[PDB]
Design a binder for this molecule. Structure first.
Ligand SMILES: COC(=O)N1CCN([C@H]2CC[C@H](Nc3nc(Nc4cnn(C)c4)nc4ccn(CC#N)c(=O)c34)CC2)CC1
Length: 266
């Protein structure tokens, strides 16, 4: 990794230009992110013990489905031209809806990235669609490893709309990453945010119970902003999401099984 000076990265971001159309993209995991440059190589600058673990994980953990760390001073990464899966599911800033075909590759790519992390005995601890970034080919890239660990804790961290019941109780397990990935799969099927105060149910993970109790079908919840979804592959992704969302952690599939079920889907 390239060691930058805080004054080097100041110029690349036009004196940390906070005005968006400027250089500010938005806030992201304990800091702000700005669009910067290193010749033509467009970069993302993360203006934040806390930032020392990110480099500690990014060092050994190199994979096609993980964001690439370039250097630091601030943390610098290759700028993902298609931003977050969360923003792309909401068509933020006029972007066209993602097709079912694109959603399947993104789901498969995100699962490959989690598999690499679990193979290398790491727990992400904050799997969510805001942390799934998309490159030039809409390849899924897992980001924000600040909370990542390589068990119980007093400092409960994560996004509550995505957290497993045992994670909300203080447990640290890769099985909690599977539950959170289940919430991501529902966001992909439905195009709905994981939590919405203006909704019944308020939490997306609660549609699992609604379908199980036959008050609604998966077909009632399929994102209407696609024209290429087929009931077979949609029900097959929903089946993976449902298995990931088991209240009991040990009943949940491991990432390799999830990866295998998503591969069988296409
Ligand atoms: C209502 O609008 C809002 O306030 N929003 C909109 C903006 N949204 C976020 C803001 C943070 C963005 N983070 C990133 N973006 C981009 N590229 C990019 C964003 N947008 N586009 C078009 C292209 N590349 C990278 C590369 C690496 N890392 C790792 C780190 N550190 C990133 O985080 C990263 C993701 C979208 C939040 C809510």
């Amino acid at each position: 990794f390239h060691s930058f000076s805080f004054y080097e990265l100041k110029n690349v971001t036009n004196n940390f230009d906070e005005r968006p159309i400027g250089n500010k993209m938005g806030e992201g995991g304990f800091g702000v992110v700005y669009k910067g440059y290193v010749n033509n190589t467009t970069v993302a600058v993360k203006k934040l013990q806390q930032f020392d673990q990110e480099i500690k994980v990014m060092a050994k953990c190199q994979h096609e489905n993980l964001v690439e760390l370039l250097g630091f001073s601030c943390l610098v990464y290759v700028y993902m031209p298609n931003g977050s899966l969360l923003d792309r599911l909401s068509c933020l800033d006029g972007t066209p809806p993602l097709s079912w075909h694109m959603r399947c590759k993104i789901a498969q790519g995100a699962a490959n990235g989690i598999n690499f992390l679990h193979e290398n005995h790491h727990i992400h601890r904050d799997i969510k669609s805001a942390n799934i970034l998309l490159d030039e080919a809409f390849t899924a890239k897992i980001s924000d490893f600040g909370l990542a660990r390589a068990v119980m804790t007093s400092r409960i961290v994560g996004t509550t709309a995505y957290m497993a019941p045992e994670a909300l109780r203080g447990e640290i397990t890769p099985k909690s990453d599977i539950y959170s990935f289940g919430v991501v799969l529902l966001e992909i099927i439905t195009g709905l945010p994981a939590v919405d105060e203006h909704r019944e149910p308020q939490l997306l993970l609660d549609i699992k119970e609604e379908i199980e109790d036959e008050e609604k079908t998966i077909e009632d919840y399929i994102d209407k902003k696609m024209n290429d979804a087929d009931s077979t592959s949609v029900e097959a992704m929903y089946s993976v999401a449902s298995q990931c969302l088991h209240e009991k952690k040990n009943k949940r599939p491991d990432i390799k099984k999830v990866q295998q079920l998503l591969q069988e889907m296409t």
